[PDB]
Amino acid sequence: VEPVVVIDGKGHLVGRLASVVAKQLLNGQKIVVVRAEELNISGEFFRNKLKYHDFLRKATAFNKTRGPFHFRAPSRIFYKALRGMVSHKTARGKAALERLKVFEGIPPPYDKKKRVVVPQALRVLRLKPGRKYTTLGKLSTSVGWKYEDVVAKLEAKRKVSSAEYYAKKRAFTKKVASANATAAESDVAKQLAALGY
Amino acid sequence: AHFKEYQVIGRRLPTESVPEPKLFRMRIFASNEVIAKSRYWYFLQKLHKVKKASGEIVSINQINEAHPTKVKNFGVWVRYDSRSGTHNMYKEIRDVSRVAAVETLYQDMAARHRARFRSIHILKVAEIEKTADVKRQYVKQFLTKDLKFPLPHRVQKSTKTFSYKRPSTF
Amino acid sequence: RSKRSKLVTLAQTDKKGRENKERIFDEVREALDTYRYVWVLHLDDVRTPVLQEIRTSWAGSKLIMGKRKVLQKALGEKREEEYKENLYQLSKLCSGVTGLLFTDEDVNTVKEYFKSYVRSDYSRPLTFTIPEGIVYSRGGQIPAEEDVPMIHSLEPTMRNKFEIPTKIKAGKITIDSPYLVCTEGEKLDVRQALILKQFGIAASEFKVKVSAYYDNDSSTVESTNIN
Amino acid sequence: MRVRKRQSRRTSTKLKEGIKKKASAHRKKEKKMAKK
Amino acid sequence: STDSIVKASNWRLVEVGRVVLIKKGQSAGKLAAIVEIIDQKKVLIDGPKAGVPRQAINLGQVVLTPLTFALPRGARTATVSKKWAAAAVCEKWAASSWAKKIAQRERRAALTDFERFQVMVLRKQKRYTVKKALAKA
Amino acid sequence: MKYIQTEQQIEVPEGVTVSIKSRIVKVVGPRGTLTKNLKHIDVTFTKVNNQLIKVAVHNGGRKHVAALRTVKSLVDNMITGVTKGYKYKMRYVYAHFPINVNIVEKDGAKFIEVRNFLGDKKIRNVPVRDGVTIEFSTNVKDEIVLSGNSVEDVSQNAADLQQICRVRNKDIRKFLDGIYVSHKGFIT
RNA sequence: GGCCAGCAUCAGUUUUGGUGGCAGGAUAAAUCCAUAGGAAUGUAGCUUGCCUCGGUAAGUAUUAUAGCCUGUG
RNA sequence: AGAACUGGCGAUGCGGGAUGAACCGAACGUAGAGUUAAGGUGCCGGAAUACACGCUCAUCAGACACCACAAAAGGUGUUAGUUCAUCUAGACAGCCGGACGGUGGCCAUGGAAGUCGGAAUCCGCUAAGGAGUGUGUAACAACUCACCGGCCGAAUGAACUA
RNA sequence: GCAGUCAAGCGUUCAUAGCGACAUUGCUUUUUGAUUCUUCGAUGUCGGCUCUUCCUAUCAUACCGAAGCAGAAUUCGGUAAGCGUUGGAUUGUUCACCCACUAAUAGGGAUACCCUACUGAU
RNA sequence: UUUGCUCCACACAAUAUAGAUGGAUACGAAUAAGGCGUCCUUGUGGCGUCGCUGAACCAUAGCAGGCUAGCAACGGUGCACUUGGCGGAAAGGCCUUGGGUGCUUGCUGGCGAAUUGCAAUGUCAUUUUGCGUGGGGAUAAAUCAUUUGUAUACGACUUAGA
């Protein structure tokens, strides 16, 4: 429906987000993803770390400079397990992934913009309670992403500036809501109340 | 499938010097009439040495249960032939009608013992009108009075893919 | 799965069953009609040779012990059901461990004999201590020459559950500081009861008490409330 | 560490449709032994 | 300040006499009441005053409400309609905001485009008034 | 088999307070304050009045229930830390070589130093944690006293030092020396 | 009178909706109404122990200040 | 490898089996529309993150029949069971006490007393208590359960199955 | 290996129509380390280097548990493959087997300018 | 090496879109919990209220959006100026003062629409570039050749030279 969609990757699941992201791509909704270090995976840390090490040991026997790249950072993990879902070798693939832009944290301009989610991939919904999961930021930090303390800091700055925004917006919407309330019990409003507004 | 209850009554053969072999009925569970008839011959062969050519149906009657509204804690005896040799069972159910109860039971055996419908003889199904004859706990715990319990963490299901709310259960 | 495995033995002993329960339930009612009196004796802490002694003492009387509700089975708790009349009232008062006595000689000799009968048993009374030196079988109650040292195997237990500071040099056991084991005028902790067991100190007075009696030909309850 | 080899569940053909083809012949052997 | 303030965990727990709303079937957004639980997942219901017949159901096809009244188990439909009339639940539902929202979407869909034009012009008339309510005070 | 619910209760005396937001628990009372996080175990609390409180599980499995009694065992220990406070005691023993024992406060870290283990030259530091106090023993030779409100903290600290003074390469059937605990009781 | 399209009506194949009338089975079972009896996961009422003076626990109590089940019609 | 009946191949495309000498389906003019088969519907990939009952959480989970299978068995992981048992005349857990004599039973021995050890292995009182499971003294000694009773009160244990 | 015993279980139902779990007993070239120098048709073509990587079921190097561990060193076992495993003596022959060092001297597998790969360069 | 290079607007040309055709509308944090209004003892505080999908919110009428008339209110909004702020993670945008400048569908009037002939995307946006426009702005390196040699297969890397 929109030109652009801006996903928060928090409390989310890699496979089940990758899937919908792929289909929305190949139907043509340009997508950006952010906060991928707040992402999550089913299964415990040790399981996911061993799944990563078994990939890690796989390179070309004779020359590693051409062989598989064991990318570390979380956005690139999500991109890995998305380009497995699309035909990157073709041109339709490459012209899908020229619609995908994946980041950590929320850099600009997107921090001022509307973050969304996907309910059919959330952890809290699409898992049972009383069950494990792994934080991707911690996993990447445990296999050599050397950056985790920094996105923390910038997330702090964005959080405080957004809370200071939220105060203003809450006050202003309080004012307009009080105004519309005072605008109530007036026939110009009562007609709309009859017609569902 | 969506099971049904069926009366089936059969008669060995009209024959000279043995007219009207006495009668043979069964209470039978199936989706339609034909599977009832086939299960009827299948169990009826087991009881004694007769066949479909040496057999015949008297008639059948579909059985609508008398009290749909009434909860009825049933208890049922079953024999079945598993992967290994056969063995028996008694189970305890809190369901509405015999048909919905056994429809749940066949699924339950299908889960817990890989019980397909062929190898599972309904020995008997019954009602337990009073308390103090239930043995199990996974029925008993629903029966105390003033009973209440919550449904936490309802997994809602949106049709849309995106949403703008970072949702909440309740 | 994931159970606590109940530990099993191969002992030649066997369990009691219900045959003993029905046996004593029969024998109580057997004693009832044949004997005249039915005495109730409240006693919670009793000794095996002492019970042997009092068993062999009174053959004219018959002492029997058993579970409370099995005695209620035999005698019958209510007035509505009982072996004979005017026993249900005595059925109520018997709260704790009780031993039933059946006499036919005299009502007064029974109540007075056990008030005369007093012994020395463990508290379960005065205070005691140990010196800050070598420890003995009594632990300084007697002269140390005739007092023999405790055996060194149980010294870790003294450290563990009696909590006492101790350290084992060559075979004499020793300590650095003394410890008053208990005080007077208070019912004892389990460590205090057990250390006076280990010393072998039955410092507590012991009297078996009576709470009531019965008599058939009168068919009445004798209320004798004494300790 | 040095996490060890994972053995496949791939097609890798011997097993699967040709060996218990022979094991269908083993069911034949079961019939041959059931006579005794 | 010598006491604990631990939360309620206010949950719409199911019980006999609890009241619910159905979201698919043929009942299709009608109220209903609860006569007897069977299991965690299956219950047994009727509201005749809302219109639905008596039946078993799995809870996935329904959703609860905060509302609740007094009722005994194993009841019959005359009895529950009687208690329903005693509680006056339909008017209370109408008083609530949920049903107002539901009727709002229903009317908002069942609008005609000419009525929507009237909605447009009325909102235009409103916004000038309210935007002058602001920026003056 | 989904026991539809199960419950235990935590009974509490008057003078202590407790307070719980979602699973974040605090205990304030005579000795002072304690706090713990329970966001990982997915249970539910409810108060009746002011001495007693019901943990509870709805629609739970065996593991999901076996959390519960452990939580009860946690919370009673928490409360009793505030009512009584806990007391452990160790003795630093030797055959031939007298141990040196020392508290040191460097950078406010309150380290515990030990030396002269069978004549070894190495210094072995054992730090001290929050909310736990240490006391060298009065009038008991070769003895040390611990005091605090957090059982887990004091016990972990007691374990650290007796692992750090651990003998290796040698036979404990002949060699004896090592710091262990006399007992584990309350302050009161 | 060459090219591309659209609208209506009909024909063939085919897909997908709403609505109407009918026969059946236990002439559905059910619900509902009347009716006898019963019991409780015991309703009113009564009784007891405390006790914040109702609130528990029992014991009664078979519609009573709630109702349910079976059986018949 | 020894024999015999039938079928598929070889001459034979096509949909599926991820791909195939042997599997499932189905045999062909060119084309349009329709509907299905076997197989499937998270994405690659056309088709539902449909509904419903259960189970399972694997430090290599598993994901298809014959197209990489093993049992016997082991498992204080979980579930559904069968059969035996105990139980408000008080089930099991847990605390305390009782847990006696000839007896330190017999030779064995330098010393061996409930247990370095061989034979035997009983009876009185008993609620119960064996010529005595483990702890251990050179011997003894002392402690515990198995055997019973108390204090708390509802269910619980054993074997076996899948 | 063969033949029993013990025998959880199985068998239209089953001891005894019959199998069978685990242990046990039967000598199998000598009861007092006296030895006996027993290599008895090795019928195949590799053998021996330059030299790279991988596996561990580790020979030392790590950290650990238990063992009569008083110590030193040793006997086993566990996680462990990060790093290391030699110089000579003897046959066309790999078969055969010593001396000494070191911490040890573990076992295994894998013409050529032409396009590719590798090492390097604009 | 003829006056080339740039930035302000603008008339015309081309060159094509991984595909605009009302709005990419901002808290964070948990989910066996929380948002919002409010109260005071400022709290892990109380009181009320909400959720069950944004099927919302904001915007929206005029010829693809004209010319004009007023009524009432001091507002909203575009455009270029102007003031002071804020923000470095990939800021390249978000605020705010001042006026100027319009339009107002907030209410009520008048004029015009034809003929594309019943529809035919019925062209409205935005990338890049060029040639011409009349107005400001600044008027350099590198390579080769040569020489060295810290380098050296040839190239290259490093140096020097008005």
JSON list of N, CA, C and O in Angstrom, two decimals, chain B residues 30-59:
[
{"chain": "B", "resi": 30, "resn": "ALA", "atom": "N", "xyz": [-18.80, -44.77, 12.20]},
{"chain": "B", "resi": 30, "resn": "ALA", "atom": "CA", "xyz": [-18.30, -44.54, 10.85]},
{"chain": "B", "resi": 30, "resn": "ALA", "atom": "C", "xyz": [-18.82, -43.19, 10.36]},
{"chain": "B", "resi": 30, "resn": "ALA", "atom": "O", "xyz": [-19.64, -42.54, 11.02]},
{"chain": "B", "resi": 31, "resn": "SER", "atom": "N", "xyz": [-18.34, -42.79, 9.18]},
{"chain": "B", "resi": 31, "resn": "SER", "atom": "CA", "xyz": [-18.81, -41.57, 8.54]},
{"chain": "B", "resi": 31, "resn": "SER", "atom": "C", "xyz": [-20.05, -41.78, 7.71]},
{"chain": "B", "resi": 31, "resn": "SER", "atom": "O", "xyz": [-20.86, -40.85, 7.59]},
{"chain": "B", "resi": 32, "resn": "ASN", "atom": "N", "xyz": [-20.19, -42.94, 7.10]},
{"chain": "B", "resi": 32, "resn": "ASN", "atom": "CA", "xyz": [-21.32, -43.25, 6.25]},
{"chain": "B", "resi": 32, "resn": "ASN", "atom": "C", "xyz": [-21.71, -44.70, 6.45]},
{"chain": "B", "resi": 32, "resn": "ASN", "atom": "O", "xyz": [-21.11, -45.42, 7.24]},
{"chain": "B", "resi": 33, "resn": "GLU", "atom": "N", "xyz": [-22.71, -45.12, 5.69]},
{"chain": "B", "resi": 33, "resn": "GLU", "atom": "CA", "xyz": [-23.30, -46.44, 5.89]},
{"chain": "B", "resi": 33, "resn": "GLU", "atom": "C", "xyz": [-22.35, -47.56, 5.49]},
{"chain": "B", "resi": 33, "resn": "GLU", "atom": "O", "xyz": [-22.32, -48.61, 6.13]},
{"chain": "B", "resi": 34, "resn": "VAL", "atom": "N", "xyz": [-21.55, -47.34, 4.45]},
{"chain": "B", "resi": 34, "resn": "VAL", "atom": "CA", "xyz": [-20.83, -48.43, 3.83]},
{"chain": "B", "resi": 34, "resn": "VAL", "atom": "C", "xyz": [-19.70, -48.89, 4.72]},
{"chain": "B", "resi": 34, "resn": "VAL", "atom": "O", "xyz": [-19.45, -50.09, 4.85]},
{"chain": "B", "resi": 35, "resn": "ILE", "atom": "N", "xyz": [-18.99, -47.94, 5.31]},
{"chain": "B", "resi": 35, "resn": "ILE", "atom": "CA", "xyz": [-17.89, -48.31, 6.17]},
{"chain": "B", "resi": 35, "resn": "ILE", "atom": "C", "xyz": [-18.43, -49.03, 7.39]},
{"chain": "B", "resi": 35, "resn": "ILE", "atom": "O", "xyz": [-17.78, -49.93, 7.93]},
{"chain": "B", "resi": 36, "resn": "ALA", "atom": "N", "xyz": [-19.63, -48.66, 7.83]},
{"chain": "B", "resi": 36, "resn": "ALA", "atom": "CA", "xyz": [-20.28, -49.37, 8.91]},
{"chain": "B", "resi": 36, "resn": "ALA", "atom": "C", "xyz": [-20.54, -50.82, 8.52]},
{"chain": "B", "resi": 36, "resn": "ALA", "atom": "O", "xyz": [-20.26, -51.74, 9.30]},
{"chain": "B", "resi": 37, "resn": "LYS", "atom": "N", "xyz": [-21.07, -51.03, 7.32]},
{"chain": "B", "resi": 37, "resn": "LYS", "atom": "CA", "xyz": [-21.36, -52.39, 6.88]},
{"chain": "B", "resi": 37, "resn": "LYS", "atom": "C", "xyz": [-20.09, -53.21, 6.77]},
{"chain": "B", "resi": 37, "resn": "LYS", "atom": "O", "xyz": [-20.06, -54.39, 7.13]},
{"chain": "B", "resi": 38, "resn": "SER", "atom": "N", "xyz": [-19.01, -52.59, 6.31]},
{"chain": "B", "resi": 38, "resn": "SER", "atom": "CA", "xyz": [-17.79, -53.34, 6.13]},
{"chain": "B", "resi": 38, "resn": "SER", "atom": "C", "xyz": [-17.15, -53.69, 7.47]},
{"chain": "B", "resi": 38, "resn": "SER", "atom": "O", "xyz": [-16.70, -54.82, 7.67]},
{"chain": "B", "resi": 39, "resn": "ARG", "atom": "N", "xyz": [-17.14, -52.74, 8.40]},
{"chain": "B", "resi": 39, "resn": "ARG", "atom": "CA", "xyz": [-16.67, -53.05, 9.75]},
{"chain": "B", "resi": 39, "resn": "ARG", "atom": "C", "xyz": [-17.55, -54.09, 10.41]},
{"chain": "B", "resi": 39, "resn": "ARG", "atom": "O", "xyz": [-17.07, -54.90, 11.21]},
{"chain": "B", "resi": 40, "resn": "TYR", "atom": "N", "xyz": [-18.84, -54.09, 10.08]},
{"chain": "B", "resi": 40, "resn": "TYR", "atom": "CA", "xyz": [-19.76, -55.04, 10.67]},
{"chain": "B", "resi": 40, "resn": "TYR", "atom": "C", "xyz": [-19.42, -56.44, 10.23]},
{"chain": "B", "resi": 40, "resn": "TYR", "atom": "O", "xyz": [-19.31, -57.35, 11.05]},
{"chain": "B", "resi": 41, "resn": "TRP", "atom": "N", "xyz": [-19.21, -56.62, 8.93]},
{"chain": "B", "resi": 41, "resn": "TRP", "atom": "CA", "xyz": [-18.79, -57.94, 8.46]},
{"chain": "B", "resi": 41, "resn": "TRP", "atom": "C", "xyz": [-17.41, -58.29, 9.00]},
{"chain": "B", "resi": 41, "resn": "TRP", "atom": "O", "xyz": [-17.16, -59.45, 9.32]},
{"chain": "B", "resi": 42, "resn": "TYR", "atom": "N", "xyz": [-16.54, -57.30, 9.17]},
{"chain": "B", "resi": 42, "resn": "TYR", "atom": "CA", "xyz": [-15.18, -57.56, 9.62]},
{"chain": "B", "resi": 42, "resn": "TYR", "atom": "C", "xyz": [-15.17, -58.11, 11.04]},
{"chain": "B", "resi": 42, "resn": "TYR", "atom": "O", "xyz": [-14.48, -59.10, 11.33]},
{"chain": "B", "resi": 43, "resn": "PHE", "atom": "N", "xyz": [-15.94, -57.49, 11.94]},
{"chain": "B", "resi": 43, "resn": "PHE", "atom": "CA", "xyz": [-16.03, -58.00, 13.30]},
{"chain": "B", "resi": 43, "resn": "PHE", "atom": "C", "xyz": [-16.92, -59.24, 13.38]},
{"chain": "B", "resi": 43, "resn": "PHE", "atom": "O", "xyz": [-16.70, -60.10, 14.24]},
{"chain": "B", "resi": 44, "resn": "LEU", "atom": "N", "xyz": [-17.91, -59.35, 12.51]},
{"chain": "B", "resi": 44, "resn": "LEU", "atom": "CA", "xyz": [-18.84, -60.46, 12.61]},
{"chain": "B", "resi": 44, "resn": "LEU", "atom": "C", "xyz": [-18.21, -61.75, 12.13]},
{"chain": "B", "resi": 44, "resn": "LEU", "atom": "O", "xyz": [-18.53, -62.83, 12.65]},
{"chain": "B", "resi": 45, "resn": "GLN", "atom": "N", "xyz": [-17.32, -61.67, 11.15]},
{"chain": "B", "resi": 45, "resn": "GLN", "atom": "CA", "xyz": [-16.51, -62.82, 10.78]},
{"chain": "B", "resi": 45, "resn": "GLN", "atom": "C", "xyz": [-15.68, -63.31, 11.95]},
{"chain": "B", "resi": 45, "resn": "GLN", "atom": "O", "xyz": [-15.50, -64.52, 12.12]},
{"chain": "B", "resi": 46, "resn": "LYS", "atom": "N", "xyz": [-15.15, -62.39, 12.75]},
{"chain": "B", "resi": 46, "resn": "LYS", "atom": "CA", "xyz": [-14.29, -62.78, 13.85]},
{"chain": "B", "resi": 46, "resn": "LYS", "atom": "C", "xyz": [-15.04, -63.57, 14.90]},
{"chain": "B", "resi": 46, "resn": "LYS", "atom": "O", "xyz": [-14.47, -64.47, 15.53]},
{"chain": "B", "resi": 47, "resn": "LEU", "atom": "N", "xyz": [-16.31, -63.25, 15.11]},
{"chain": "B", "resi": 47, "resn": "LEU", "atom": "CA", "xyz": [-17.06, -63.88, 16.19]},
{"chain": "B", "resi": 47, "resn": "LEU", "atom": "C", "xyz": [-17.39, -65.32, 15.86]},
{"chain": "B", "resi": 47, "resn": "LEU", "atom": "O", "xyz": [-17.39, -66.18, 16.74]},
{"chain": "B", "resi": 48, "resn": "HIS", "atom": "N", "xyz": [-17.69, -65.61, 14.59]},
{"chain": "B", "resi": 48, "resn": "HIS", "atom": "CA", "xyz": [-18.02, -66.97, 14.20]},
{"chain": "B", "resi": 48, "resn": "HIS", "atom": "C", "xyz": [-17.88, -67.10, 12.69]},
{"chain": "B", "resi": 48, "resn": "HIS", "atom": "O", "xyz": [-17.71, -66.11, 11.97]},
{"chain": "B", "resi": 49, "resn": "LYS", "atom": "N", "xyz": [-17.95, -68.34, 12.24]},
{"chain": "B", "resi": 49, "resn": "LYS", "atom": "CA", "xyz": [-17.55, -68.72, 10.88]},
{"chain": "B", "resi": 49, "resn": "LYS", "atom": "C", "xyz": [-18.72, -68.49, 9.93]},
{"chain": "B", "resi": 49, "resn": "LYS", "atom": "O", "xyz": [-19.50, -69.39, 9.60]},
{"chain": "B", "resi": 50, "resn": "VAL", "atom": "N", "xyz": [-18.85, -67.24, 9.48]},
{"chain": "B", "resi": 50, "resn": "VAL", "atom": "CA", "xyz": [-19.79, -66.84, 8.45]},
{"chain": "B", "resi": 50, "resn": "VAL", "atom": "C", "xyz": [-19.10, -65.82, 7.56]},
{"chain": "B", "resi": 50, "resn": "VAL", "atom": "O", "xyz": [-18.00, -65.35, 7.87]},
{"chain": "B", "resi": 51, "resn": "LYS", "atom": "N", "xyz": [-19.74, -65.48, 6.45]},
{"chain": "B", "resi": 51, "resn": "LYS", "atom": "CA", "xyz": [-19.16, -64.67, 5.39]},
{"chain": "B", "resi": 51, "resn": "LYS", "atom": "C", "xyz": [-20.23, -63.73, 4.87]},
{"chain": "B", "resi": 51, "resn": "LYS", "atom": "O", "xyz": [-21.39, -63.77, 5.30]},
{"chain": "B", "resi": 52, "resn": "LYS", "atom": "N", "xyz": [-19.86, -62.85, 3.93]},
{"chain": "B", "resi": 52, "resn": "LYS", "atom": "CA", "xyz": [-20.85, -61.96, 3.33]},
{"chain": "B", "resi": 52, "resn": "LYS", "atom": "C", "xyz": [-21.82, -62.73, 2.45]},
{"chain": "B", "resi": 52, "resn": "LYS", "atom": "O", "xyz": [-23.01, -62.39, 2.39]},
{"chain": "B", "resi": 53, "resn": "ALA", "atom": "N", "xyz": [-21.34, -63.77, 1.77]},
{"chain": "B", "resi": 53, "resn": "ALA", "atom": "CA", "xyz": [-22.25, -64.61, 0.99]},
{"chain": "B", "resi": 53, "resn": "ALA", "atom": "C", "xyz": [-23.12, -65.45, 1.90]},
{"chain": "B", "resi": 53, "resn": "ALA", "atom": "O", "xyz": [-24.30, -65.65, 1.62]},
{"chain": "B", "resi": 54, "resn": "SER", "atom": "N", "xyz": [-22.55, -65.92, 3.01]},
{"chain": "B", "resi": 54, "resn": "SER", "atom": "CA", "xyz": [-23.30, -66.55, 4.08]},
{"chain": "B", "resi": 54, "resn": "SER", "atom": "C", "xyz": [-23.80, -65.53, 5.11]},
{"chain": "B", "resi": 54, "resn": "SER", "atom": "O", "xyz": [-24.08, -65.91, 6.25]},
{"chain": "B", "resi": 55, "resn": "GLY", "atom": "N", "xyz": [-23.86, -64.25, 4.73]},
{"chain": "B", "resi": 55, "resn": "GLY", "atom": "CA", "xyz": [-24.37, -63.21, 5.59]},
{"chain": "B", "resi": 55, "resn": "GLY", "atom": "C", "xyz": [-25.35, -62.34, 4.83]},
{"chain": "B", "resi": 55, "resn": "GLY", "atom": "O", "xyz": [-25.43, -62.40, 3.60]},
{"chain": "B", "resi": 56, "resn": "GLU", "atom": "N", "xyz": [-26.10, -61.55, 5.58]},
{"chain": "B", "resi": 56, "resn": "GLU", "atom": "CA", "xyz": [-26.98, -60.57, 4.98]},
{"chain": "B", "resi": 56, "resn": "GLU", "atom": "C", "xyz": [-27.40, -59.58, 6.05]},
{"chain": "B", "resi": 56, "resn": "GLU", "atom": "O", "xyz": [-27.49, -59.93, 7.23]},
{"chain": "B", "resi": 57, "resn": "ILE", "atom": "N", "xyz": [-27.66, -58.37, 5.63]},
{"chain": "B", "resi": 57, "resn": "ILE", "atom": "CA", "xyz": [-28.13, -57.32, 6.53]},
{"chain": "B", "resi": 57, "resn": "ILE", "atom": "C", "xyz": [-29.62, -57.49, 6.74]},
{"chain": "B", "resi": 57, "resn": "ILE", "atom": "O", "xyz": [-30.36, -57.79, 5.80]},
{"chain": "B", "resi": 58, "resn": "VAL", "atom": "N", "xyz": [-30.06, -57.30, 7.98]},
{"chain": "B", "resi": 58, "resn": "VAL", "atom": "CA", "xyz": [-31.49, -57.14, 8.23]},
{"chain": "B", "resi": 58, "resn": "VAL", "atom": "C", "xyz": [-31.90, -55.72, 7.89]},
{"chain": "B", "resi": 58, "resn": "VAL", "atom": "O", "xyz": [-32.70, -55.47, 6.98]},
{"chain": "B", "resi": 59, "resn": "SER", "atom": "N", "xyz": [-31.33, -54.76, 8.59]},
{"chain": "B", "resi": 59, "resn": "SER", "atom": "CA", "xyz": [-31.52, -53.35, 8.33]},
{"chain": "B", "resi": 59, "resn": "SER", "atom": "C", "xyz": [-30.53, -52.61, 9.22]},
{"chain": "B", "resi": 59, "resn": "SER", "atom": "O", "xyz": [-29.81, -53.22, 10.02]}
]
